[PDB]
Amino acid sequence: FNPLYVMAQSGARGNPQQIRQLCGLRGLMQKPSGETFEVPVRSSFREGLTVLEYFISSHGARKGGADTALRTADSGYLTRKLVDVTHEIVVREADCGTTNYISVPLFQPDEVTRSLRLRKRADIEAGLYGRVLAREVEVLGVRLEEGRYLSMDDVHLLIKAAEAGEIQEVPVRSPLTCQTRYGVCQKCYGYDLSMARPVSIGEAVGIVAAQSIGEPGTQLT
């Protein structure tokens, strides 16, 4: 029930490295060249640093600041570019009638190149959640019909099926294969993620995409 511990564990405040710097050691530091100093700070913030340790840490702190500062502008610029390239894209109709689609893989080649291994849960979710099945899928004695919007439970089911070897990829409607002019159709887009239900016709999904991609731009290190 220690304060730092409770805050870190609950998710209220703090991560392991910050806690470590408070209680353990400050650790290794970089030179202004990116090169790392051989001698780490053995002191924590509790114990207090020496002036030399503080000065050595300043290089890294400053580099971090300059990095952030230079990152916000490139991120804003990128966002404006994305907005200008996507702005006309709107959900204009219910269904373009395409029979084209993409296949989202549930497995990926390992770096060992030994075989294929199941992709991470979050990745599969980010590729499947709220999407419309482009073909009938039959797994674990369950029918997932063509035209079905994949709920999170459907995704988890598909993951289970993949683990049992019943499926390696999922046929899905996608903006990539949508044949709607100047936009996408409802089926190829899938869920309005903010409402966990099919997207309303008229939604400016291009703008939403640009913002969705641009927003975490300043978190990318």
Partner 1 sequence: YRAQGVKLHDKHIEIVVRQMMKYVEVTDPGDSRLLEGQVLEKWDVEALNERLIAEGKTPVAWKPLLMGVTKSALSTKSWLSAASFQNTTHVLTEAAIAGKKDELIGLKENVILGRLIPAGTGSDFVRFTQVVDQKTLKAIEEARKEA
Partner 2 sequence: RVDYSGRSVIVVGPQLKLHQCGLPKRMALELFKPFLLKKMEEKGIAPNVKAARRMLERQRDIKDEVWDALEEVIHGKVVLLNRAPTLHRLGIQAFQPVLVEGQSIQLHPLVCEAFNADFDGDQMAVHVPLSSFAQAEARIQMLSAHNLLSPASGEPLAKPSRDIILGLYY
Partner 3 sequence: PQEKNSLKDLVYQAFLRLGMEKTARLLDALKYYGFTFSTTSGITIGIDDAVIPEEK
Partner DNA sequence: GCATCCGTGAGTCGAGG
Partner DNA sequence: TATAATGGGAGCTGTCACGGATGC
Annotated binding-site residue? 185:
yes
The residue with tokens 């894209």 is 89
Name the segment binding DNA (CB under 7 A); options: 6-14, 65-73, 137-145, 188-196.
Answer: 65-73
| N-term to C-term CA, the chain | 33
User: Is position 23 annotated in a ligand binding site?
Assistant: no
The contacts of residue 124 (CB under 8 Å, 6+ apart) are 104, 106, 155, 158, 159
By CB under 8 A, which span of 33-41, 42-50, 126-134, 141-149 interacts with partner 1?
126-134
With respect to partner 2, which residue has the nearer C-beta, 23 or 208? Answer: 208
Q: Is 126 in the site for partner 1 (CB under 8 A)?
A: yes
- Smallest gap, in angstroms, from Cβ of residue 54 to DNA? 24
Binding-site ranges for partner 3 (CB under 8 A): 2-4, 6-7, 9-12, 22-25, 44-47, 151-152, 196
For residues 97 and 186, the answer to whether their CB atoms sit within 8 Å is no
Task: Read off φ and ψ for residue 191, nearest 5 degrees.
Answer: -65, 145
**Nearest C-alpha neighbor of 149 from the set 72, 95, 82:** 95
Write each residue from 177 to 196 as x if it is in contact with Zn ion (CB under 5 A), else as -, in one continuous string: -x-x----x--x--------
Query: Measuring CA to CA, which residue among 210, 202, 209, 208 is closest to residue 91?
Result: 202
Min dist CB 72 to partner 1, Å, is 15
Closer Cβ to DNA, 76 or 97, answer by number: 76
- Decide: 101 and 173 in contact? Cβ < 8 Å: yes
User: Cβ 23 to partner 3, closest distance in Å?
Assistant: 5
Which residues lie near Zn ion (CB under 5 A)? 96, 178, 180, 185, 188
